[PDB]
Design a protein around this nucleic acid. Sequence first.
DNA 1: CGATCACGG
DNA 2: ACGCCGTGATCG
Length: 580
Amino acid sequence: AKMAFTLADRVTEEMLADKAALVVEVVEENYHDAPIVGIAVVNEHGRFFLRPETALADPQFVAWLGDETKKKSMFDSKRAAVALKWKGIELCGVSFDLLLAAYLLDPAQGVDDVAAAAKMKQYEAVRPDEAVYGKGAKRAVPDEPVLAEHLVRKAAAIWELERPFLDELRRNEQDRLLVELEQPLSSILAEMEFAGVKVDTKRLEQMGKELAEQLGTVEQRIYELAGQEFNINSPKQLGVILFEKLQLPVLKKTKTGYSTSADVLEKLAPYHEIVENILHYRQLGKLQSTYIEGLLKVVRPATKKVHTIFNQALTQTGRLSSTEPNLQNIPIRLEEGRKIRQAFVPSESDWLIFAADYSQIELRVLAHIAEDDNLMEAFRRDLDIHTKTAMDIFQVSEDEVTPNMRRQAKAVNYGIVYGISDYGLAQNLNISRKEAAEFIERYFESFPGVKRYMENIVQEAKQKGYVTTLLHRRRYLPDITSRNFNVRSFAERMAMNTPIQGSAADIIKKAMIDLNARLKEERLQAHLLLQVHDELILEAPKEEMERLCRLVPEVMEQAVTLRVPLKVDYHYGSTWYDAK
DNA sequence: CGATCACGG
DNA sequence: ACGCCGTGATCG
Ligand SMILES: Cc1cn([C@H]2CC[C@@H](COP(=O)(O)OP(=O)(O)OP(=O)(O)O)O2)c(=O)[nH]c1=O
Ligand SMILES: OC[C@H]1O[C@@](CO)(O[C@H]2O[C@H](CO)[C@@H](O)[C@H](O)[C@H]2O)[C@@H](O)[C@@H]1O
Ligand SMILES: [Mg+2]
């Protein structure tokens, strides 16, 4: 169609109205220190394209960007706010984010550009980003006339789409979810990303050297026990060595061949001691490629900071994800890998890392939603839920529960409600299927409210076509009412899990908002560095630690009010490792 | 490029 | 058929 706009040479007053759609275009997927390629503004007065050299050097435009009373509608304002922070420019007054609006309406659409959001409301006057920029190796900023139209069309779409999106969100009881939760969170995340996390690169390099030496050792020992050289990192080549050369029993097959999973290898340990060396090599290899080589590749060598990106509009359940680097999967469960955490350090001298974590938040959320008398009682009385379950499924008194029995009970606790089978429980814990089935019966008899939640939540999903979380986030499950046992089954387990995992996401998000408010309120230097699903990581001057110790846990625990209390553990020290 | 494997929640 | 949600390295 025909859409008129001003390809402007200079900023003018009518471009600085107090309500506008604004596009600050960053074409690099990773927007940290990335170029801004163009600016579009659409308001009551018209449509404008501005060259970034010009607009970002203009004191009036920069003031307008920074003024919170001048309201902007955008798509992915976090991308813009961060790219602008790298250029030394503050962005304020973002009142609508089309990306977050589309995400809330349906995460399954995987909306990742203005065009994809526009399609939800049959708005077609805008091209997909991939069509304008090209895919893969063809990725390129087009000629200025083409770029300018594309950006103005994006700004025009946001301008037209705000009301229809807000109208549907309001209808879904998700309007406060957008304006009071996700949008404020976006600003908090932008600050966390830009600040970054400081890394001890010398320590990482030292670990890397040693690891390469252990790797070399374990590798040769594997070749020696196998009587051949092969690529150990090739599950397929490893399959041949284990199941053809060594004639080890084939315990599991996939559509592609023999499994060499950690679980299969565990079950093969009575047969040959090689499998235990292979497990060791894989643990070492992971630390090396992922957490040494990977981290050092992205660290900024002049500041020693890593700058992750929290994807706020990706997961189906309302969790965040973290990329380039992922800081939500740094090792903790085994002591060797946990030491990577010593390389995560305060950004200034005399600062400390502070870490706080919800205790068993998903099971507390389950207690609340299911209204199981027995489960609710456990949390109100501050009992250990994993020990209690152990007592119920092993039919023993409390003192008889072993640390191993607690671990098995933890697997039961995080498995049954989400649809684990007796088979799955038997395979995962390497125990008899008959006993696994008894565990499952005893659990349900001990927590009958949980059995009824599973039945009721699946019924609700079938009747409504979606499930909802505590703060009204939705996930649609069109696959749920199918005759196809597998497709229906996978959808049923999503119905069981999403309300629990998604409600836990809602609670921590609200917690981050409340916390930001107070830190700023009491004018502390403390700020957030990271969120890890049910944990918050901060850094602060050491003097601030007696305050954080009282403030952080309280904000966290009172974020929402449930039919059971929420519990938070917290720790500080001179590295992330030490914050335990 | 989709599976496999390992790491976290 | 066989708990859920993620990212990265690596393979063929
Ligand atoms: C280990 C593991 C964990 N999870 C999720 C669900 C919980 C969170 C946090 O794990 P944690 O051991 O702290 O659990 P928590 O209940 O906090 O137990 P602790 O009191 O920390 O022992 O991770 C899981 O889904 N499957 C697993 O096998
Ligand atoms: O800016 C993050 C935001 O952008 C999207 C696309 O709209 O994802 C892009 O950026 C991510 C972070 O660099 C990449 O991981 C992703 O591959 C890229 O498409 C959204 O998905 C995201 O919320
Ligand atoms: Mg825990």
